[PDB]
Symmetry: D3
Subunit: 160 residues, 6 copies
């Protein structure tokens, strides 16, 4: 199975929206969420990747226990989250701990329960509601194949 | 000046929806919220009150630090959240700790920041979204004068 | 299906071994565990039950987020962990939230992954190691069907 | 073999919320959020089935490896006692350890408890009501187990009524 | 208006006193506080600055939720806490999140409630009581005007 | 009195096993423990050391309150935990905070409570029981002298 390193930024259950500066490597508090919400999974980005956005690929890792900001996690993709915000479209690869036999039952998006997909979906749609000039309008889940595809592309974009 | 005991059953920043079984007096777990949200303020009910649904009038206490389920808080009202859900209407009296000079600046609804109010509204609208048969269709923030009316109106229902 | 209330004595991830006093209903601290390990799931006993020893039938509740000591949970049995401690035999009914469609996929002992069962098993074997005179020799897993009997056994002898 | 009793913990260690169990109801109430940037240095509560001069149970300080929740019972034995003087006059707070726990066998009398912790506990109770409107602390000091047991002994026979 | 990056080294509600080694940039546990107190705000230092100490200016950031050690926070001054300890005089800039509309009502030291200002003062007056050969004899608050002066002085001292 | 810097990797009470990448410097999640156990003391490694197995000296630090991953601590040794996992000798140097008057009564292994030494031993022996092809077959405590000697050997190994 495919594998890559994910740098976690925001731990599951956080309302503080942390970001990592991609030059200094410092953790930074972007802002406190204006809505009464909390990140449903550990949120971050895939190290050594690059998209059309300019930034690296955003990522979502399902973990038994959350971690700290800036922490590295070797993960593998089981799907991807496509959505359209006020900055056009951005993608978010759904991931699972790599080299962990406890996560062998989750091989693709269909193995991730709809309840958690619906929750993650719900979060990203509404978390910016009370921020002027910010929104999330479209959202849908796509399978491991297109996720691995988009990751394969974005690894190559980083090389050049 | 009004004053009453609010039994807080759900702490701030929690996703486990706790209920106090008014018959037995025990703290019961109702459900884990289906949306990835957390209670904006400590949420509970007012003691020795009663309403149309046979359940006590609900309360929202603003605190510098959260409390535990089943904890009592001497509180005074400063507004009320009027919402209309699945089971008709449910009004929630926004309160402040009584006998605390640190909260003397909060007298009426206008004294509470609009951002806190928008966040509290946002929660009670959206928190039952993914649950089937559950919904919310009207949501307003009324002043203290009306909150004091709805308390007293509900206090007397208990007296009967 | 069968359904009952479980009082949670010890939250998941606890080294403090709480126990509910059954003559009063109070939450007594039994002891801080001598071993460097925490309770693998939310732990407690089934309400309105009585065993071969005078204590209610012990129970484990699979939960997404842990609760507090003394909290009630509408439960549904899906298996049972039998051990043999220093005081002879003991029974541990493995349960899930009753009425939560997120736990409809778990209908029997086999549905729970064997890593969570081995973890639970590993805890109850070793947690009394450094305590003197106390031990655990035999420890195996039975199925839902037999667990349901043990409950109903404990129910009827309680009725008497 | 020794003297012991129940202790209902009201406030866990590291807390700024001032919880109070109603002795007539059994309900846990939030008294106040401490007005100073200080946390309770030990698990604070009272000795169950006692009665102090003030018509309330004798206060207790239980040293624990890990804190508990409010309303939790802990079988305990006294090791010393904290006597202070505040706006109400003089309160008495029994310093305790878990009863029947051999990990605390090395703490028999107050001299066994290290100085930095006794100071830390005292320092809290001197300063915790400084910024609080009409409340203050004048004096505070420690006494040995002999005196500690005696006040509990007075407090237990005084309970019978 | 003036604005800068604060590096929070000690989160709010902490008795562990962390500090950043300004040469290596790594976090270091200086000492567990000898008194039973906790930092009332998030405590840190201003980046790209230097006082007479040979050390940057210490910063006090008011936040809705605390951050982790080493996290950057874009902030602006609204006052300054000036004290005199055993080593000499130490000054601490009282800040709020910059570019955050929820803190736009906080403009000067007068806008921060006195209760919180007394509390912050009380910490630094008493947190080194039980520490030997360590004390403070002066503790006063000053406005943004004088605060901004010291922040600028030290920004200029940085260039060498 | 010998002293040195320890980098803490895993705070006391964690089930997430973090690891500092020595060649990189970043914190990584190695694995979530398969056993239901938690690290009984803060665990990490001594800075600028080198052993037969290519890593630095693993170290245990007794603290009143835990730290975060990557935090540095001035520490002095009082003993050493000898163990033999699947990869032969993997000793752990037991430490206390250096220059902290509250730890002066702890000068050698005998001064540490036996119950806490039993718990540390217990942890490392069992925490890989459920992981296949992994174990700990040996476990012994030794003098401060033995500990100090092994440390000084590995400081010698480092200079190359
Ligand atoms: Mn990202
Ligand atoms: Mn993006
Ligand atoms: Mn918007
Ligand atoms: Mn209602
Ligand atoms: Mn039980
Ligand atoms: Mn008293
Ligand atoms: Mn005063
Ligand atoms: Mn300074
Ligand atoms: Mn400093
Ligand atoms: Mn001093
Ligand atoms: Mn090693
Ligand atoms: Mn290692
Ligand atoms: Mn094995």
């Amino acid at each position: 199975a495919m594998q890559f390193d994910v740098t976690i930024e925001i731990p599951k259950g956080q309302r503080n929206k942390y970001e990592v500066d991609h030059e200094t490597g410092r953790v930074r508090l972007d802002r406190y969420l204006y809505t009464p919400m909390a990140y449903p999974t550990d949120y971050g980005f895939i190290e050594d990747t690059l998209g059309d956005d300019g930034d690296p690929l955003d990522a979502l890792v399902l973990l038994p226990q959350p971690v700290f900001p800036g922490v590295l996690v070797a993960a593998r993709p089981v799907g991807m989250f496509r959505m359209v915000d006020e900055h056009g479209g951005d993608d978010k690869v759904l991931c699972v701990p790599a080299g962990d036999p406890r996560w062998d039952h989750v091989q693709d998006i269909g193995d991730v329960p709809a309840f958690e997909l619906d929750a993650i979906k719900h979060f990203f749609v509404h978390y910016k509601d009370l921020e002027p000039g910010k929104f999330v309008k479209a959202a849908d889940w796509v399978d491991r194949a297109e996720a691995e595809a988009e990751v394969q592309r974005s690894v190559e974009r980083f090389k050049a």
